[model samples]
Target: RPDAAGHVNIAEAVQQLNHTIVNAAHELHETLGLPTPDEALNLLTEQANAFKTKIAEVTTSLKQEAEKHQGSVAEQLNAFARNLNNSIHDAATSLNLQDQLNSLQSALTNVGHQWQDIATKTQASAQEAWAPVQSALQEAAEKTKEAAANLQNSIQSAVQKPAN
Candidate 1:
């Protein structure tokens, strides 16, 4: 339910969930024959380590792609600039071509647009590479929460069982 003012209260939600998890963990620990709290803690720690390694894999792949293509675009642009600068300089000195020089302004503008296009493409590539890792982290969080809830329910049921 939203607050009295009708806004979703994230703080309240987080607090409620945290309270439930802590209470459930306490119940789980109290119930004998349930896996010890240390086991769950260890499993969570192991999962976090695995996630860190997975993130490293994502980082490595991005770095590899960057190594392959990162500066090549800029290099091509710099080469074009240098070649154009020399040609323009020579033409200005030898030809007295005002119209040609003026026309190159549009060419310079086109180069700027091309660089922007490359940047947009690069950003899209980064987003694509990041998507799977983002999803994996989200799914891991959801699954761990569900597992904790299930453990809590099981512990509660066991503790509530009437003795014969």
Candidate 2:
């Protein structure tokens, strides 16, 4: 919508840009705090990119607002728009959620190791008692490992999004 709101004065443009930054910030925060389903992670990537584009669109319109005016008011509006641009960019970077994904993957791996430890302890405590449960314990550890692997794979795929 760059330059589309030609009738909007500098004050109005500043208000809109401020609101845009706040809205995008809140949207990203709420989206990131949700459960990380497969589609949800993918949607996060899409939303982040669109936020970048949307910020650019609004800033360009603000520049248009600057050109139509004069004096200190015109100067501050463009400067304010650029500062808002930086803030939105910072928000998108911090809210991208990749670090959280890595933390989750690591937590899953820790759980997998705990299952493996349990399996080992059972074998060490008593052979006769462990015999019947030997295969079961091993199977549980294997299944836990599979879960961590599955999560790791998803994290990798999400990070390697196409064309960026």
Candidate 3:
């Protein structure tokens, strides 16, 4: 039950935080011009680490925020859960960014020369690295979905007439 002050809309806060993360990732991808071969690997590693850190921090923050609002605002919470899933899907698999990377990889094949081999290998490695990112995003979405559904189910059960 909500107190006089009323429960907070933590769900909307989580959604906004997620939107910020997706936008930041899109901006980072847009500004990431071709780096010199000597710095390419390091640059990619740093960018990937930055995204990873941001995702982890948001995941923790959202979990804590959602925990505070347990049993309050089930419908909004459920909608936010779906929004989170969609946002994560967009962030983890933006076709425009994927196509841009693919085009860059193909360009590297021609202009790369000695670096061509390195670029090809790096592209392959990048795909492997993205697998875990997608997996984690999907798992987090599943958790949100399950939590929302369970909360809704419990609410329904509580309001129903007795079986006997």
Candidate 4:
């Protein structure tokens, strides 16, 4: 459905990725208020799946758009999507950003602590099980941070080269 000009802007794809990441964080945070920790986790699972789908869609469009351009920026976009595929799926369901905040250092930090304190208080009945959840949270946080940095840095230098 692309025009003859094939007007699929790479930066727009990046914004889609950015928007999805923000939504994932918001939904991830929402899971915290569910009836129970397990309930929260159930919702997190759903959110993660949706997040994965959203990323895949954006990645697809991004790569396709990147296909039209054969330059350093284009190659960077390919690598960017590759990096996203490598670890971004694990970035939304849980959060554990103790030291890796990237530029999104404010809300994510609170979400991390909120996740820990709130989750632990409710799930203490199964102490060891929390380990998996904790790691998941940490991974999600790291992934989101990593994805955020990747997008920021990508967009920072992504659109500068005109290839003209």
Question: TM-score of every model?
Answer: 0.28, 0.36, 0.28, 0.40
Model 3, span 1-164: residue lDDT tens: 44212222222223433443333333333334444323333333333333333334434433344354431522333443344333333332323434333322322121112212222332444544223323333445444334333322332333342332
- Return the lDDT, model 3, position 160: 40
> Between candidates 1 and 3, which one is better according to lDDT?
1
Q: Which ten residues in a row have the lowest lDDT in candidate 3?
A: 107-116
On TM-score, the candidate that comes out on top is 4
Candidates in order have lDDT scores of 0.37, 0.39, 0.33, 0.40
Cα lDDT for residue 5, candidate 4: 35
Q: Candidate 4 residues 46-150, lDDT tens each? A: 434444444455445445544554323446436544554444444443444211122122333333333333243323334443333333333444455454444
Better of 3 and 4 by lDDT: 4
Least accurate 10 contiguous residues by lDDT in model 4:
97-106
Instruction: Specify the poorest-scoring 10-residue window by lDDT in model 2.
Output: 105-114
> Candidate 1: which stretches are off by over 4 Å?
1-8, 33-143
**TM-score of model 2 vs. true structure:** 0.36
